[PDB]
Design a protein around this ligand. Structure first.
Ligand code: NA
Length: 233
């Protein structure tokens, strides 16, 4: 380490580093969905400087906007593939804890047969589900370990350490801090994270609507997610 880093430096309105990040050009199509996952009800993703830009103050801004009756936001899919024996950290400010918003900082292995997902910072604007941290052994969501974690609008560092022994999560780490969650290896059915050559890509998004987002009618838009850095070492 650092094996991967992005400090998000650059002039205001510029785009994130295209060698490091690929912005979603649309919101994923959900199968047989709940109301707020219906395609006409979800908020869309655009690779647009109105929704994903650098502020010129060394933050990535992911901003939800309302344009007429439709909502738009951003999702960054990182190119870096990191493996077992790495720590992943993002410093983030959730200026978007409002109705409809569904921001997240997470890690993804997209393998259809053995994929997995580590959501270390997730907040639900649907006014129902508690914010928290989730390890997903299966992408279908049927084999997981979760821990609700209060999430406010202050700056926080969110950390995951991935070792052969499992997954460790810290909020605002310091030397001597005990992890607030430790998910042991093989503690989940179909646990994939100890497989040969398993890699995880860093992900950032502010979704609007969808199941976790809910109805954005009551929310204050525009709404912003700030990312000072993402680092892997
Ligand atoms: Na920065």
């Amino acid at each position: 380490g650092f094996v991967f880093r992005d400090e998000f430096d650059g002039p205001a309105g510029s785009a994130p580093d295209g060698s490091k990040w690929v912005a979603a050009k649309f919101r994923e199509r959900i199968k047989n969905p709940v109301f707020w996952d219906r395609p006409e009800n979800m908020g869309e993703y655009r690779d647009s400087r109105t929704n994903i830009f650098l502020d010129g103050n060394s933050n990535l801004v992911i901003r939800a906007t309302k344009e007429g009756n439709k909502y738009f936001s951003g999702k960054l899919h990182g190119t870096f593939r990191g493996g077992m024996g790495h720590t992943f950290e993002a410093r983030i400010k959730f200026n978007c804890l409002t109705d409809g918003c569904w921001p997240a900082w997470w890690l993804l292995n997209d393998n259809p047969e053995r994929g997995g997902e580590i959501d270390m910072a997730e907040w639900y604007g649907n006014r129902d589900w508690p914010s928290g941290t989730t390890v997903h052994a299966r992408l279908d969501g049927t084999s997981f370990e979760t821990l609700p974690v209060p999430i406010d609008s202050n700056w926080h560092t969110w950390r995951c350490t991935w070792t052969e022994a499992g997954l460790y999560f810290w909020m605002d780490y310091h030397d001597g801090m005990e992890p607030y969650l430790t998910v042991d290896a093989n503690s989940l059915d179909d646990w994939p994270f100890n497989d040969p050559g398993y890699t995880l890509q860093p992900m950032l998004n502010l979704a609007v609507a969808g199941s976790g987002g809910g109805d954005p009618a009551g929310g204050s838009y525009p709404a912003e997610m700030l990312v000072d850095y993402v680092r892997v070492w």
